[PDB]
Amino acid sequence: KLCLVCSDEASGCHYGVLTCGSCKVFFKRAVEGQHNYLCAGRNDCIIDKIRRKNCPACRYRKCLQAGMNL
Amino acid sequence: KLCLVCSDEASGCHYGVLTCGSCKVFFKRAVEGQHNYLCAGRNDCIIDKIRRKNCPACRYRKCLQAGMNLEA
DNA sequence: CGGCTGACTCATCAAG
DNA sequence: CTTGATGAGTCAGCCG
Ligand SMILES: [Zn+2]
Ligand SMILES: [Zn+2]
Ligand SMILES: [Zn+2]
Ligand SMILES: [Zn+2]
């Protein structure tokens, strides 16, 4: 019952994937607007409830890898 | 906290107006369905929790007079 | 209906 | 102060 992107409690199947609400609207914002997020680490940041704001780049990558799409 | 159309307990701002769930669904089917509504009295019916089922014409008219709009 | 999911809005924070 | 990112809340269509 866990968000496949950040492991928060999932609220439902959004854009094809079991995710929480915050990840649902994160993906929609990221897929429409500008694209160029930059990772400050090595593109494998830990994305969980407490750290998901740190790296949009890695959070967006995980959304794609889990299969989110419009 | 009461539906502006039938005075039943309101549920939220629906189609631009504070209304109940039943009136919300009624209004959308009225706007979009093929509907020959005719009042059996004087186009001035009492519309409440029970009587709203009797006169869809007056119920509709009240929906529109209250401001409901599917675009709102 | 009411469950499901998407669109939209707004308060709160971080940054500058 | 302003700007931008975040996430919670409300209400929309659709479906059964
Ligand atoms: Zn998540
Ligand atoms: Zn990263
Ligand atoms: Zn009502
Ligand atoms: Zn009537």
Strand C nucleotides below 7 A of a protein CB? 1-2, 4-9
Which residues keep their CB under 5 angstroms from ion ligand 1? A 3, 5-6, 8, 20, 23
Q: Which residues contact B28 (CB under 8 A, 6 or more apart)?
A: B15, B70
Length, in residues, of chain B: 72
CATH of the domain at B26: 3.30.50.10
Which three-class secondary structure string do you get for chain B?
A: CECCCCCCECCEEECCEEECHHHHHHHHHHHHCCCCCCCCCCCCCCCCCCHHHCCHHHHHHHHHHCCCCCCC
Q: Which residues contact A2 (CB under 8 A, 6 or more apart)?
A: A8, A9, A10, A18
The total number of structural domains that make up chain A: 1
Nearest to A55 by CA among A16, A17, A5, A15: A5
Task: Dig out the tokens for B65 from the structure.
Answer: 């007079």
What is the distance between the alpha carbons of residues B26 and B22, in angstroms, rounded to a whole number?
6
Task: Kindly calculate the radius of gyration of chain B based on its CA atoms and give it in whole angstroms.
Answer: 11
**Residues 1-60, chain A: which have Cβ under 7 A from strand C?**
11-16, 24-25, 28
Task: Dig out the tokens for B46 from the structure.
Answer: 């009492």
**Reported resolution, Å:** 2.3
Q: How many CB atoms lie within 10 A of CB A35?
A: 8
Q: Which residues contact A12 (CB under 8 A, 6 or more apart)?
A: A18, A19, A24
Range of the domain at A70: 1-70
